[PDB]
Amino acid sequence: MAYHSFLVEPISCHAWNKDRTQIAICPNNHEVHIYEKSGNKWVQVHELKEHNGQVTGVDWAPDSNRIVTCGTDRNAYVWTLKGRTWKPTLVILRINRAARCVRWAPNEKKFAVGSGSRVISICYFEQENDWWVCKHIKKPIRSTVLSLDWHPNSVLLAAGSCDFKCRIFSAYIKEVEERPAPTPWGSKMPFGELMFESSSSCGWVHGVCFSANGSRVAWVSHDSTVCLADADKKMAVATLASETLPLLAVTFITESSLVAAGHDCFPVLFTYDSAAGKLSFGGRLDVPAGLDSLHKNSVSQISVLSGGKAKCSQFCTTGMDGGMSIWDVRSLESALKDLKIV
Amino acid sequence: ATLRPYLSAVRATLQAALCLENFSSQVVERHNKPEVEVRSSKELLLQPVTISRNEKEKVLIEGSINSVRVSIAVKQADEIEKILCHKFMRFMMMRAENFFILRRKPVEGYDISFLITNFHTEQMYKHKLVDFVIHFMEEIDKEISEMKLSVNARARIVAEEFLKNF
Amino acid sequence: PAYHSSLMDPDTKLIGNMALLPIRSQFKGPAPRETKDTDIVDEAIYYFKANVFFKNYEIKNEADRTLIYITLYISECLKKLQKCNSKSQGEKEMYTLGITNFPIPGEPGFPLNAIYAKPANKQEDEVMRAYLQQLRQETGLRLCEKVFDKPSKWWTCFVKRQFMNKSLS
Amino acid sequence: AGRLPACVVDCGTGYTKLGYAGNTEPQFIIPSCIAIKEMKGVDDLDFFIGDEAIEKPTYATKWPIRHGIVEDWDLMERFMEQVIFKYLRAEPEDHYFLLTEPPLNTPENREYTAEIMFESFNVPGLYIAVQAVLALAASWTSRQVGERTLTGTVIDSGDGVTHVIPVAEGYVIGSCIKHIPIAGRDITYFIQQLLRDREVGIPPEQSLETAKAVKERYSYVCPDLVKEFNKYDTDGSKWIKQYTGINAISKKEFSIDVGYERFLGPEIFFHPEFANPDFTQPISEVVDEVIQNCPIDVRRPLYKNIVLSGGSTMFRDFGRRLQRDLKRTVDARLKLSEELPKPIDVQVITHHMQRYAVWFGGSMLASTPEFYQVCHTKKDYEEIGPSICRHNPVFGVMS
Amino acid sequence: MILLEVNNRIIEETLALKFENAAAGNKPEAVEVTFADFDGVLYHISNPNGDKTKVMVSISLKFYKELQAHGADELLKRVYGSYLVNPESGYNVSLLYDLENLPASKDSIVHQAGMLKRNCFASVFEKYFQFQEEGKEGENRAVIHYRDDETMYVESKKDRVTVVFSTVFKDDDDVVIGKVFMQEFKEGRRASHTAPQVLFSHREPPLEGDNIGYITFVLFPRHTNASARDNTINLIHTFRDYLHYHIKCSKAYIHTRMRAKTSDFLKVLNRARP
Amino acid sequence: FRKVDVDEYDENKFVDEAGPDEGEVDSCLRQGNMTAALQAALKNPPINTKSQAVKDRAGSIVLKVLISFKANDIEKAVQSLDKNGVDLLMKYIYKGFESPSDNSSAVLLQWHEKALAAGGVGSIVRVLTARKTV
Amino acid sequence: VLTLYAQGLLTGVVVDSGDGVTHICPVYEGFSLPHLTRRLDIAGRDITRYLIKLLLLRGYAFNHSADFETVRMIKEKLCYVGYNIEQEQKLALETTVLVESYTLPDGRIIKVGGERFEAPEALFQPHLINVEGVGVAELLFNTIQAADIDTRSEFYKHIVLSGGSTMYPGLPSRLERELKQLYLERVLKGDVEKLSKFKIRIEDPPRR
Numbered sequence A: 001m002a003y004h005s006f007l008v009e010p011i012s013c014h015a016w017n018k019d020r021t022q023i024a025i026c027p028n029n030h031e032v033h034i035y036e037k038s039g040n041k042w043v044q045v046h047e048l049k050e051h052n053g054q055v056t057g058v059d060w061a062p063d064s065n066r067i068v069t070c071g072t073d074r075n076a077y078v079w080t081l082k083g084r085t086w087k088p089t090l091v092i093l094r095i096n097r098a099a100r101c102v103r104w105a106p107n108e109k110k111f112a113v114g115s116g117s118r119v120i121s122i123c124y125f126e127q128e129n130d131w132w133v134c135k136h137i138k139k140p141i142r143s144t145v146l147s148l149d150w151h152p153n154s155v156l157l158a159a160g161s162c163d164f165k166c167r168i169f170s171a172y173i174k175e176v177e178e179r180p181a182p183t184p185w186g187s188k189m190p191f192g193e194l195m196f197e198s199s200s201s202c203g204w205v206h207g208v209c210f211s212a213n214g215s216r217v218a219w220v221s222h223d224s225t226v227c228l229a230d231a232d233k234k235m236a237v238a239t240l241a242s243e244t245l246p247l248l249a250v251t252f253i254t255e256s257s258l259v260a261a262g263h264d265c266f267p268v269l270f271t272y273d274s275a276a277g278k279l280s281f282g283g284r285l286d287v288p289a290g291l292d293s294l295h296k297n298s299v300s301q302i303s304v305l306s307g308g309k310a311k312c313s314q315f316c317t318t319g320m321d322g323g324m325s326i327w328d329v330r331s332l333e334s335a336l337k338d339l340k341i342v
Numbered sequence B: 001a002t003l004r005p006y007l008s009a010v011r012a013t014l015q016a017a018l019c020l021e022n023f024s025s026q027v028v029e030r031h032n033k034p035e036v037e038v039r040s041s042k043e044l045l046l047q048p049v050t051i052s053r054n055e056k057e058k059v060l061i062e063g064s065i066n067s068v069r070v071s072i073a074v075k076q077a078d079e080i081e082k083i084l085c086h087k088f089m090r091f092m093m094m095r096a097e098n099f100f101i102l103r104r105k106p107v108e109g110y111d112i113s114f115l116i117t118n119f120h121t122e123q124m125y126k127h128k129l130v131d132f133v134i135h136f137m138e139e140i141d142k143e144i145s146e147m148k149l150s151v152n153a154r155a156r157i158v159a160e161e162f163l164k165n166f
Numbered sequence C: 001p002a003y004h005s006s007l008m009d010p011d012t013k014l015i016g017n018m019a020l021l022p023i024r025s026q027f028k029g030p031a032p033r034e035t036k037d038t039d040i041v042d043e044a045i046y047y048f049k050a051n052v053f054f055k056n057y058e059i060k061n062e063a064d065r066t067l068i069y070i071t072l073y074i075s076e077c078l079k080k081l082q083k084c085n086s087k088s089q090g091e092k093e094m095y096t097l098g099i100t101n102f103p104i105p106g107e108p109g110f111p112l113n114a115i116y117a118k119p120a121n122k123q124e125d126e127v128m129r130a131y132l133q134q135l136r137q138e139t140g141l142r143l144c145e146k147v148f149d150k151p152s153k154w155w156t157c158f159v160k161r162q163f164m165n166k167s168l169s
Numbered sequence D: 001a002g003r004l005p006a007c008v009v010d011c012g013t014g015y016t017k018l019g020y021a022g023n024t025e026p027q028f029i030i031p032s033c034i035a036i037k038e039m040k041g042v043d044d045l046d047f048f049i050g051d052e053a054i055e056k057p058t059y060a061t062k063w064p065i066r067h068g069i070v071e072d073w074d075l076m077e078r079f080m081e082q083v084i085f086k087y088l089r090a091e092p093e094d095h096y097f098l099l100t101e102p103p104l105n106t107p108e109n110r111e112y113t114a115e116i117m118f119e120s121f122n123v124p125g126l127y128i129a130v131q132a133v134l135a136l137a138a139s140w141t142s143r144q145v146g147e148r149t150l151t152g153t154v155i156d157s158g159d160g161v162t163h164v165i166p167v168a169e170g171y172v173i174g175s176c177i178k179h180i181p182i183a184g185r186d187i188t189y190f191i192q193q194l195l196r197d198r199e200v201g202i203p204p205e206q207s208l209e210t211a212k213a214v215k216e217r218y219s220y221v222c223p224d225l226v227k228e229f230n231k232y233d234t235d236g237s238k239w240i241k242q243y244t245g246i247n248a249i250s251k252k253e254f255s256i257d258v259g260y261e262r263f264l265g266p267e268i269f270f271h272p273e274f275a276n277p278d279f280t281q282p283i284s285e286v287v288d289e290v291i292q293n294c295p296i297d298v299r300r301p302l303y304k305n306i307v308l309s310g311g312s313t314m315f316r317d318f319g320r321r322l323q324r325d326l327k328r329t330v331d332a333r334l335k336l337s338e339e340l341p342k343p344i345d346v347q348v349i350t351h352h353m354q355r356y357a358v359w360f361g362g363s364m365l366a367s368t369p370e371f372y373q374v375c376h377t378k379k380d381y382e383e384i385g386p387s388i389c390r391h392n393p394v395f396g397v398m399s
Numbered sequence E: 001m002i003l004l005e006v007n008n009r010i011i012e013e014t015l016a017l018k019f020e021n022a023a024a025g026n027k028p029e030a031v032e033v034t035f036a037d038f039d040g041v042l043y044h045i046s047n048p049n050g051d052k053t054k055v056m057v058s059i060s061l062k063f064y065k066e067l068q069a070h071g072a073d074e075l076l077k078r079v080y081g082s083y084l085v086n087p088e089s090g091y092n093v094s095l096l097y098d099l100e101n102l103p104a105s106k107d108s109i110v111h112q113a114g115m116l117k118r119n120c121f122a123s124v125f126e127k128y129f130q131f132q133e134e135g136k137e138g139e140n141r142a143v144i145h146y147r148d149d150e151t152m153y154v155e156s157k158k159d160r161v162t163v164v165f166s167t168v169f170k171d172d173d174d175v176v177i178g179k180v181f182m183q184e185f186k187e188g189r190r191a192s193h194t195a196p197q198v199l200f201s202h203r204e205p206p207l208e209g210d211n212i213g214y215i216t217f218v219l220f221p222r223h224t225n226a227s228a229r230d231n232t233i234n235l236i237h238t239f240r241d242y243l244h245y246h247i248k249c250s251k252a253y254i255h256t257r258m259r260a261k262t263s264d265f266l267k268v269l270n271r272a273r274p
Numbered sequence F: 001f002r003k004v005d006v007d008e009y010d011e012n013k014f015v016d017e018a019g020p021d022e023g024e025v026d027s028c029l030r031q032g033n034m035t036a037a038l039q040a041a042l043k044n045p046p047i048n049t050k051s052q053a054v055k056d057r058a059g060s061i062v063l064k065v066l067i068s069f070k071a072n073d074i075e076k077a078v079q080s081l082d083k084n085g086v087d088l089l090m091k092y093i094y095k096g097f098e099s100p101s102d103n104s105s106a107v108l109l110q111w112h113e114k115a116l117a118a119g120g121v122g123s124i125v126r127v128l129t130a131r132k133t134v
Numbered sequence G: 001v002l003t004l005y006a007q008g009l010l011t012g013v014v015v016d017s018g019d020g021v022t023h024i025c026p027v028y029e030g031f032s033l034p035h036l037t038r039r040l041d042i043a044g045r046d047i048t049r050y051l052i053k054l055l056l057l058r059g060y061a062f063n064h065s066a067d068f069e070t071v072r073m074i075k076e077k078l079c080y081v082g083y084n085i086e087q088e089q090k091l092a093l094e095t096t097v098l099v100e101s102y103t104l105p106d107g108r109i110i111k112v113g114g115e116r117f118e119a120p121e122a123l124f125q126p127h128l129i130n131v132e133g134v135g136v137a138e139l140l141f142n143t144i145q146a147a148d149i150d151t152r153s154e155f156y157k158h159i160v161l162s163g164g165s166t167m168y169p170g171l172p173s174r175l176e177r178e179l180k181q182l183y184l185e186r187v188l189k190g191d192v193e194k195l196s197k198f199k200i201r202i203e204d205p206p207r208r
């Protein structure tokens, strides 16, 4: 509904701060531009120039107000605001291929970087040598990691890779956190332990997402399918094949309602029926260049702006068209009298 | 009567195949290569498909995570058509740098080949690129018939001008 | 480049920042009496045809400002002399032109106010006024014997050209 | 070299010089224009070129070349059609061809040319020589030059814009080239005005024709304007010439007096400001500027060999006047230094073949055995493609 | 230009300027020129012994003896008379013009000089047009190798004279494009019922390799009689170069077409940009 | 020493993890039950066999049924299939395109049009995405 | 030694390539071993010089003395190391993916393609620039094979790169693929199955 163009080229990735008062985007560059809203206008306030290759992921730790980025230059940088300038701190990831994605753990004590080195770098800060160090989750990743998403417990981590699998690992780092409480996903969670692995053997997994309480993980694959597995039904997996193009990003908006977007260029709704254990198409959310959708190219990222993944009231999409859209769930519900969430 | 259906199948197949995204090389440090060309990571290559009008006219579409190769087998009803097509395709390939989505050489067994990468689908509406390939297929068929007539039309005036001077 | 006066003496006088150069003349004015066989007016007429085509002129000294002024004035004489029809008639319009009050440095209408200094007071104003008229009168006289053969087309051909694209009018 | 001499073709913005290798002058010098009707049948063939294409009642005149570079390939390709089958009368498959190009010509334009020569005309071999290198080869004919060399500064002034091109060991230092917004046309345009403000009886539709005639028949470069202006006023009878022309309509004669414009015309090379508001730098300074921009180690070799090329450099004493003015600039500059270095020898070569220096240099090289070896052949074109015409190995000096 | 011109512009103009100057009274300029013509012809214009008052025009044809075996010398002497002198070493026919003794009307000789090559070809055709007009059948045919690997055959019959050309098509494709032009000559009578008949084969020679084409021109008395004889000779001896010339101009035309279609394609692709 | 493609033996490389009843299909096909032929001919596809022959056999059986149909009866048949069926038909329609003979591509282009309408471009996508296909 | 100290090490083979020369400095226990330290006559300028010659065959006539600093710019921005030359020559020859625009100081634009990887290929094939030798990769192989059998595996697992001429995208991968090749031939004498166990990764840290 509410569309804004920051540029005509792709917005590789984005991240909002705690207040959603500012958004950082990568304008298909080596840099990150931060925009702040003033009235009904967007004003550029910062420029993070440090990566020596295209930025692929961006995540903003809310409380600590720390932005983390990763790029094809094989590096990752943690940005801290010192007065009126963001300063970067290099992080050695020990990878020999491009970084692809990165997400701060909910507890902000560590972040995870997925890379083409066929591994996930778990990074945390050691305040005894003043530097970020990392541990690698290797097995059984056989290809590049496209996306990551932490479980609300800051320990389990969902990951999608080009080996067609959606997995859940333990990213438990004893030096910064306490041993995790049990979860339906399993009781044993030593670092790198594989908690779950999808069975399908086709389609790159572009996006992965945990539900608000974390008992459900959903991912979208290139073979135009969406999936959801919940630890409460013994990890049963519901699967839905679409009639349209591949989805590239997905997020829960309630415990049983997903919103995704991809190469069709518009957001759609998916709902899950716990009893039946089946997923169902909920409809196109952007109903009316040469296209009848807000975005004029592939939507590659979506994120909740408010209400959390438990009762989302507004979400955001950024795409290869350079646009950023803000969707209001409540409005979408009025505009579409036959829409059904949860 | 068989063209419209043929181009509709080819169109749907391109739309499905032209779903690309930037992919840094997982094989070579800090490289970025069209995967359908280097084919060094089998899991990144999609299944090759074909759409044939008949035993002669057909299109081969090869997709991967960041690139798509498209090869067209043009209609050539006779010798003069064959050499005309070969000259035009050669004419365009020599100019492949201005035709940024054209391949300098076609895949063995085809007359002309395209290589559409994620960079193309980034700065050009993919539905517009799909349109172009379909437009291209039709238009080259027409231009070839216009060339064929020209040669014949001019051949006649040339034979008459000479003969009528005796 | 263009042709610059070489009459600047270590002891030459100044009326504004123009050089009060001697001239062998009979008309009244503050110009010093000239002994040598050539003055700033012969130098101006000799350099005219060439200099007139130039657009950029570098003022080397105050003698050049006096030279520039005369070159601009010659163009004025040709405009008039052109429509004349006898060396005697030309001599008439030459007196009449020499008398008219053309604008001077610092006034609205003078072509090079950024280069020529303005009279500092009422006396400089009167002296300068008189020195310019003296130059004009003598210029128009010596120039009148050149231009006439019948005003030679070899002088008339310049009526349209302007030194540095300027005009005393 | 076999039985037949190669064809040599030098296409310029205004004139095209064509002929056979070995000869001293071109067999045809024609305006680089083509007249067409303004396409079914053979209408692509209804056209004329050269002078026969300038005043054709029912044909639109066109110029395929701007700033020495082909702007219309269709029209250019047809121009070559008549160059070969009508004027040269050569079976294109039996003769190697040598074509010329301006320094700013792209390798892309070179492939377009090769495609036309090989695809359309089936030539057995093609070589695309750089115009500046040919000018330097042609200067070898000069007395002033003792040993053959391809290191030098070339002043090419034809009809469009003039170019100060530095060349080292056969290859142009493209990044150090400079152009001068003054050329043949500018000089005629200036002489034309000098004629309007003075002479009468000149047929309005023949103004440019008369100015151009006077430019090539009575103009020259003088050492000093006032002295020169004075020689004319002091003697008129010995400096004022007479040009009579033919009234194209009245078919009658009209005569005018030719005066000052004789030396004022070429002067704009040294005092551009006389006619061009946007440019003031004298040619001698641009030459100095170009050479000072080149590598230190090659500046003296450049100063020692300033070769001329083009019709616009044909004015008497042009070289003398350029050498004098350039010697002063370098002498003064070298003086200040001493105040705050072995003298620099400035030498400007002039020869008989200047009007067609490029063509001549080309004719001489295309008559040698080496030319045939460095020429890209038809077999090479077929097997490797038109890209083999991107680089044309220089030859003629080393041996 | 559809028909190929028959006269040599280099020859004509070299001569015209020389006569214009000789006639004006100027001192003669030296002249030295080498140039060619279709069919491996090489010309030479120069001042023998450096005597600038004398200008010589020589032509060299590798197949001259064959033309000479069919009346070439006799015919050439008729046309040039005294301008024709002993051949310059390396050439077969030499014309010589004394600048200090030219005729009142020059163009007549300037024009004839320009047709030197054509006049060397002339006699072979006049010889057989002659046979046919005297019903002298059974005569041996003339074989002229106008190119290293192309041949012309002339044979006279009771009511027609035949000229068969054995031309080569270098490119494998050029044969096809050539079939198109010949097909049209083949049916030309459907446009000029009185014009000559044209037969064509692709490898097989008539009764009279992949790239050889035999063209046969049947000439009738209305084409070989004394009145149409010259125009007919001007056309038939240029035929081969007329065919190859047009095949190339055809390719040039197709280029302009291809430049147009490609340019159009490039316009659409770019309209696809945001 | 550069001729050996060392990457071949790299232990970081990726490595991936029968047919219809001829008579059964001819039974429905012979008894006019076209829609039943389709569904039967798409039963148990050769997706796990390394033999290209057992696959082409299944292709022939399906292709036979596809040609047997009548232009006006295709839409009805297509609609009877469940999404997975439509997916499978697509793979077959595409496999057929690889063997043009006797105007078979003419009928395969008509079937494609109906399968596409039934499964959407997504059915095509799943043809490109398969790691083991017909 | 100083280079190795930066990455917290004491033993290892360092490959430093700058503007003038390339060295292969093995270090053991914190001190260099000059008896193995070999030298490679090709480096930075050589590659820049080679780029100039490659750009000449393409129709761009740059002057070695006048435009050297300009080509260096081009080299540093567009050149890289091929991983598999055959594969690279196919991309250059059959497509335009490698083609990149480059603006010269005067405004003129040039296209650079295959010469982007062909120029740095000198480091591996010296003969391309008329220089006898083995090539940085192979040189590396010998320096470590002609050393202590016990400290050979340690060296192979600690090769570090330094110098501006080691920044070519792909260089680390090319060395690895080249060492495995030499290791599969000149060691495992042919049996591929024992190749897997051969551990080798080249440290290409972010700075220096």
Ligand SMILES: Nc1ncnc2c1ncn2[C@@H]1O[C@H](COP(=O)(O)OP(=O)(O)OP(=O)(O)O)[C@@H](O)[C@H]1O
Binding pocket: D011, D012, D013, D014, D015, D016, D067, D068, D157, D158, D159, D160, D161, D183, D184, D185, D212, D215, D216, D217, D309, D310, D311, D312, D313, D314, D315, D355
């Ligand atoms: N004798 C002469 N004196 C002065 N100028 C002459 C003389 N003869 C010819 N020109 C001038 O030379 C110019 C043509 O020279 P030239 O043929 O070298 O230029 P071009 O190659 O056709 O064009 P360009 O070199 O600018 O691309 C015309 O302006 C012509 O008037």
Ligand SMILES: Nc1ncnc2c1ncn2[C@@H]1O[C@H](COP(=O)(O)OP(=O)(O)OP(=O)(O)O)[C@@H](O)[C@H]1O
Binding pocket: G017, G018, G019, G020, G021, G043, G044, G045, G072, G075, G076, G077, G162, G163, G164, G165, G166, G167, G168
């Ligand atoms: N990104 C790059 N890719 C390839 N080469 C580069 C890059 N950046 C710089 N170079 C080259 O590296 C060389 C400079 O490296 P460096 O500064 O290490 O040399 P140096 O230490 O001054 O001299 P040396 O190491 O030879 O003794 C130059 O050739 C420069 O062009």
Ligand SMILES: [Ca+2]
Binding pocket: D011, D012, D013, D131, D158, D310, D358
């Ligand atoms: Ca020129």
Ligand SMILES: [Ca+2]
Binding pocket: G016, G018, G163
């Ligand atoms: Ca160093």
